[PDB]
Amino acid sequence: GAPATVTEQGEDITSKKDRGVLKIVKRVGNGEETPMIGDKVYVHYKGKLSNGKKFDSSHDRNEPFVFSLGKGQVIKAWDIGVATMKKGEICHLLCKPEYAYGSAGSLPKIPSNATLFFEIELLDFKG
């Protein structure tokens, strides 16, 4: 499935090159610009545990997820991953626990030491 395909074929976009955040571009975005640190970014996402269990989607309530890029308002994997995206891009990200919810997890949805999969669409970004 999607998660396994990222495991086998995803690009390692961590600076440490520890396979903590693995990426596949699924739809190419617009031009060359990526968001700046501090930008307001608007995304749609579909989130699963690595075993395929859906835990959330912004589409269920048609409500884009909004955050300030690089501010730690989201899991490290999103600060890293979304910074690499162009407007209109869809990617798949696979996120080791060290770049997500670590040993604590986020119960009830996210167990301790969970690797998470996301399909993310970068809808827009603003200053």
UniProtKB/Swiss-Prot annotation:
Acetylation impairs ability to promote interaction between Akt/AKT1 and PHLPP1. Deacetylation by SIRT7 promotes interaction between Akt/AKT1 and PHLPP1, leading to suppress Akt/AKT1 activation. Ubiquitinated, leading to degradation in a proteasome-dependent manner. Deubiquitinated by USP49, leading to stabilization. The modification N6-acetyllysine is found at residue 16. Induction: By androgen. Widely expressed, enriched in testis compared to other tissues. It is found in: Cytoplasm; Nucleus. Residues 30-118 form the PPIase FKBP-type domain. Changing residue 16 to Q: Mimics acetylation; impaired interaction with AKT1 and PHLPP1. Immunophilin protein with PPIase and co-chaperone activities. Component of unligated steroid receptors heterocomplexes through interaction with heat-shock protein 90 (HSP90). Plays a role in the intracellular trafficking of heterooligomeric forms of steroid hormone receptors maintaining the complex into the cytoplasm when unliganded. Acts as a regulator of Akt/AKT1 activity by promoting the interaction between Akt/AKT1 and PHLPP1, thereby enhancing dephosphorylation and subsequent activation of Akt/AKT1. Part of a heteromultimeric cytoplasmic complex with HSP90AA1, HSPA1A/HSPA1B and steroid receptors. Upon ligand binding dissociates from the complex and FKBP4 takes its place. Interacts with functionally mature heterooligomeric progesterone receptor complexes along with HSP90 and TEBP. Interacts with NR3C1. Interacts with Akt/AKT1 and PHLPP1; enhancing dephosphorylation and subsequent activation of Akt/AKT1. Interacts with IFI44L; this interaction modulates the kinase activity of IKBKB and IKBKE. Interacts with IKBKB and IKBKE. This is Peptidyl-prolyl cis-trans isomerase FKBP5. It comes from Homo sapiens. The lineage of its organism: Eukaryota, Metazoa, Chordata, Craniata, Vertebrata. The gene is FKBP5.
